[PDB]
DNA sequence: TGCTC
DNA sequence: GAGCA
DNA sequence: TGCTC
DNA sequence: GAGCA
DNA sequence: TGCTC
DNA sequence: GAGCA
DNA sequence: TGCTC
DNA sequence: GAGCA
């Protein structure tokens, strides 16, 4: 449910700002929100301070922010469910998409209907203290029939081959046509406060 | 094909200004069109200055009105296809819906596939020099996926009983949310240049 | 081969300056050549004294304006002739497709295997002096493989229902991103010598 | 996956500067990018601290450097592709060749489908501490229908006689018309943060 | 002379 | 449309 | 150029 | 309708 | 960023 | 390699 | 808040 | 990325 890193230290990281890919995907810190631009791969980032167990897998999931929507699931709206543009794994009403992987799994709950994308965990590279997973968004977040400018989490969860949870954590995703604009206006918005 | 009054002086006539209707759907005369909002019933007026044959009918259509779309058929988006905002008569995928006939034909032409809707010539009422048709746009200009911003052109035709081209008139149309405030945006700058 | 008027007066005219068109099309009156944007529609008119025969058509031709290429056919390069940019009628390897009509023609010359497209012709409207037809260009004058940065001809030809010429009319084409400032560069270099 | 000279101490090691080579093949240390024209040899050195076991391999291969397209195969483009340049062993869809070899392997994954050269791992000559490959780009970085200037990675890899991973190394590399004009352009942006 | 901002 | 490619 | 207040 | 999106 | 001189 | 494309 | 220049 | 939509 909340954010937690069980026994395996597990949560997630996100790319260093100037690097240029900060123009289809860009993370704010102080609002723990990606914005990012439709079908652009954003890396995220996978951080445990102990190996997971043997067939240890990695969950994405989608919901909606606010409680007024939160039992709605979250899926692309009808012009982008019919657009083709398909690429061969991801059906085309899922918003989310796993990027650099020729398995993964895309399912939908049978009691909630709620998609997501299951890949196996991965091991950070030697010499690397975290592993990049590629997610991609197939929706604006102002898509009409869709999100409908509804802001919503993206779940991440680090579950072992029997499908106990073992980690989970969170972050709030916009997609839009400017990440750089609108994260600017989010964030000067939010240290108004501060 | 352009306008064309024919042996019947037939052209349209627009609703006057400052009537609070203006604020759903108000026309450009400079511009020669029609702002309004979706949903909202426009008024159209038809002047003709000699009674057409019985059995006359009023058609209107809607085609974009740039040569490089003008070949695409004007349809709904796909999400208020789907809207489920049927009034028992319109089908689904047309833009254009008569109000206040119970007996109009919604057509597909065979050839082009284009949407028209067909309703009865009225004369106008005993003192009035025009008859009113109320017509409905069901998305708007910027809708993804239907019009995606493209401005599109109403053309409305008298045709005899057996279907000959009596008289022609067309105007530009544009759905939005704002007809007020979009109508003075397009009036000043073409102003620019007066 | 070269202009001719014919019997009937038939030339072609361009497209004014000033319109919004001029950013994907731009017609050089010094040059008699037009600068447009691949797929953009071209509107192209025909203009004749008197009214041609029965069962007249029009046909487009696309020819290398080079003595050195004079011979080599002209069609799309390798990329877009795959590229599935198909409008259902126009074969693949056509770089020339009319728009606005139903039923052309896209025929390919038995002996020199030239491709062309026919379409039949049409009076202008009430009040009109010319008719328009409308072209696109399915590939830029640059394309590798293609035309490979050679300049070409358009070939418009006004023929009867027997295929007999009647009248013959040209202009030199540019196909690329940005026909605007092509052009004046074009522009400037010939009245360099004016 | 990323650099790993493993137990063999394998790296790589590039051309000499001032050499006229230059001029076709021109490496940036700074970038770790190479410059080269088409079909030019690019001599690309090996360097070991351990002499690699009996039947080593070498294996090169071209991956987009962006993970935006990182699972996109990298293929010359529709028009190289029937250019028929072969030199009777390069399948004509092949990227990168090598040169001075009689018996190269090329290949195919099964499952990613990606291309790849082998050729058998050779010791440096008497009194020389690396061994030079010659590899050969057959397409331009903006190759459109291609890499399309899409920017890539080649992945030089040492394996045994297995196919087990001894030894990776990679680099950019830009195929382009000017390389020494390309290289200067990318080497003073970049100093402009130095 | 085409592409990114 | 400007600047870079 | 559509949506919240 | 104004201000924000 | 590729092509002509 | 420079200048134009 | 997405799209054209 | 700026300005307009
Ligand atoms: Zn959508
Ligand atoms: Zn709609
Ligand atoms: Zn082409
Ligand atoms: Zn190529």
Request: overall charge positive; charged content about 25%.
């Amino acid at each position: 449910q909340k954010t937690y890193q069980g026994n395996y230290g597990f949560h997630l990281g996100f790319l260093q700002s100037g690097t240029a890919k900060s123009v289809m995907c860009t993370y704010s810190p102080p609002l723990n929100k990606l914005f990012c631009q439709l079908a652009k791969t954003c890396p995220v980032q996978l951080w445990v301070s102990a190996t997971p167990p043997a067939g240890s897998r990695v969950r994405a999931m989608a919901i909606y922010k606010k409680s007024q929507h939160m039992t709605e699931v979250v899926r692309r709206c009808p012009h982008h469910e019919r657009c083709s543009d398909g690429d061969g794994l991801a059906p085309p009403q899922h918003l989310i998409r796993v990027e650099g992987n020729l398995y993964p799994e895309y399912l939908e709950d049978r009691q909630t209907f709620r998609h997501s994308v299951v890949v196996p965990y991965e091991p950070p590279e030697a010499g690397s203290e975290y592993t990049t997973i590629h997610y991609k968004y197939m929706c604006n977040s102002s898509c009409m029939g869709g999100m409908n400018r509804r802001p919503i989490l993206t779940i991440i969860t680090l579950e072992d081959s029997s499908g106990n949870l073992l980690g989970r954590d969170s972050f709030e995703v916009r997609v839009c046509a400017c990440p750089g604009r609108d994260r600017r206006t989010e964030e000067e918005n939010f240290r108004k406060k501060e």
